[PDB]
Structure formats: structure tokens, C-alpha cells
Amino acid sequence: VIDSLQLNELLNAGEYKIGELTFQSIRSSQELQKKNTIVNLFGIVKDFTPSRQSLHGTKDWVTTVYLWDPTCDTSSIGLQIHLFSKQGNDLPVIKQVGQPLLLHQITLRSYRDRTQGLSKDQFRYALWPDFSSNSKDTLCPQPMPRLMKTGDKEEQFALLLNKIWDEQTN
DNA sequence: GGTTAC
């Protein structure tokens, strides 16, 4: 039951809790850190690339998303995150930009002086509908393996995020 | 862990 002012309070602190998980704001994440730390993220899908199997390396499936949250400029593209899956395609099925996404277990690291996010093997996630859409089926059924059960605490934070995102781009 | 992605 938090409003638009509490959201800014939390985020502007770097680390913040929601439910039983501590989250890193998009901003503080990009604080280019050499040491690879694992974090949880919560934000709006600013842009994404559909699931495609890699053509090299261990050839794992990979979907890419760019995350956005208030601590960013409505202009910036967000934090880049590559989500990999060695166990088949049980990755987030994203329909459109604007959808709130919670990610659990993301390695933060550097690529060409910038910060980048790489998914841990056992990463889990939760995806919400794009509330600010004339469509009500913006969220399609998700694969179960990595799907987190969420409560009203994160549901509220997801509404807030999508609301604040909608305003800054209407 | 950070090759695949880029």
C-alpha cells in the first residue's frame, strides 16, 4: 500500500526491500563495479529481443531485455540484461514494452565500459501485464519452471512502476 | 561463471 512518493524514497537509496527480497535500483546497478555481484531487479521492460538460441559457445537460449525504473531518465535505454537458459526455453515470454518485470539472481558485470546483467543458471522471475494498455490480455501464460509466486506487496510496486512509466512517456 | 549476446 505504497504511493508514488514512497517509491522515489526507496529507490533513491540504492538498495530497498519488497516482500522478502532486497532489490537494487537500476541506477545504482549501473555503478560500473568490477566485482561481479548478484542482485535482484524490479523494473519496466523498456525494450526487448525475442528468445533466440545462441549460434556459438554453449549455444544456450537467450532473450534480452533493457530495464527501466524511476532512477533513470525517461530517455535512457536502461540496463541491458541477457537471460540465458541451458534447460530449454522457459524464459520470460514478453509481449510488449511497458510490462513490469521482477528478476531474481542477476550477475552485474562490465562490457565495453558499461554495466551489463547476466542471468544466473537458476534465475527466477515474475512478469506483469502492461496495466496502462487498452488491452487486458497483454500478459500471456508463462512457462512454470522459473515462475515466482508473488503477493500484493510486489503487485503494488508493479502498478506504481507501470504508472510512473506511463506518465513519463504519454 | 560470464562463452553464447553485442
Curated annotation (Swiss-Prot):
BP-aspect Gene Ontology terms: regulation of telomere maintenance via telomerase; telomere capping; telomere maintenance
GO cellular component, one term: chromosome, telomeric repeat region
Subcellular location: Nucleus; Chromosome, Telomere
Keyword check for Nucleus: yes
Molecular function in Gene Ontology: G-rich strand telomeric DNA binding; single-stranded telomeric DNA binding; telomerase inhibitor activity
Claim: DNA-binding is one of the keywords in the record: yes
Main location: nucleus
Sorted UniProt keywords: Chromosome, DNA-binding, Nucleus, Telomere
Function: Single-stranded telomeric DNA-binding protein that is required to protect the 3'-end telomeric overhang. It binds the consensus sequence 5'-GGTTAC-3'. Regulates telomerase and telomere length.
Annotated family: Belongs to the telombin family.
Quaternary state and interactors: Self-associates. Interacts with ccq1, poz1 and tpz1.
The protein's name: Protection of telomeres protein 1
Gene name per UniProt: pot1
First and last residues shown, out of full length: 5 to 174 of 555
